Design a protein around this ligand. Structure first.
Ligand SMILES: [Cl-]
Lengths: 133, 143
């Protein structure tokens, strides 16, 4: 079950890295569109979508495998904060498709706040996994 | 052996936090540039401050990581990570300068320096995580 700890750590760390890369790509893509780099922006938008799908799958696996009573509530809190973040990054993508600076501003506050919480929740989970091992 | 095992985990954790804050740092510049272009200068300035904060915390973790990377199986990767992070931090600083100056043209080149260096940072993290985990397991197989 120590092998399970390593699999859980890989899922959590990769999910969060891919999730922030998804958002970074959509913001970069938006700036590319502003500069007229429209073929390059589309690559960024495709990578944002793909990174969202991959990171969501890893979060889902993480919560499927976080059965221990010490982790159950914290893993669901991670599931919920991650869903909040993913819905903000989907908002960033829609604002980019609409080329709307104001729509981007509205949703970006939600994205930054949910990512700040993901960083602190990750540390809580790392600590619980660490005592679990 | 529990000491060297707790050290191996701390190192992996420094690396993970450092890379997450580093990517966040660049994302905040990009999204701060979009906020500034939409007239939200106060939010954009907070994002520039957060970009600086995050990359300075990352830098401190990378430096501490290298200081604690003694084994030859690890210090070569670690000094590459530190050298690559230096390039990355400079490119993100260039992104912030381009934002404060409101220049798309300056932005685009450095976002590219930044993304290149970040691609390399990501691979080095993977290699270092695997190397740390191999050392932890080697200790275990000793026990
Ligand atoms: Cl953030």
């Amino acid at each position: 079950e120590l092998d399970q700890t390593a699999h859980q750590s890989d899922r959590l760390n990769n999910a969060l890295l891919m999730a922030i890369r998804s958002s970074a790509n959509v913001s970069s893509g938006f700036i590319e569109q502003l500069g007229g780099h429209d073929e390059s922006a589309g690559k960024r938008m495709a990578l944002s979508v793909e990174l969202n799908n991959k990171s969501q799958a890893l979060v889902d696996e993480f919560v499927e495998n976080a059965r221990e009573p010490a982790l159950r509530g914290l893993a669901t809190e991670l599931q919920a904060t991650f869903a909040e973040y993913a819905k903000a990054v989907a908002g960033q993508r829609e604002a980019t498709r609409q080329r709307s600076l104001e729509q981007y501003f509205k949703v970006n506050s939600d994205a930054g706040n949910a990512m700040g919480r993901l960083q602190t929740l990750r540390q809580q989970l790392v600590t619980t996994l660490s005592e679990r091992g």
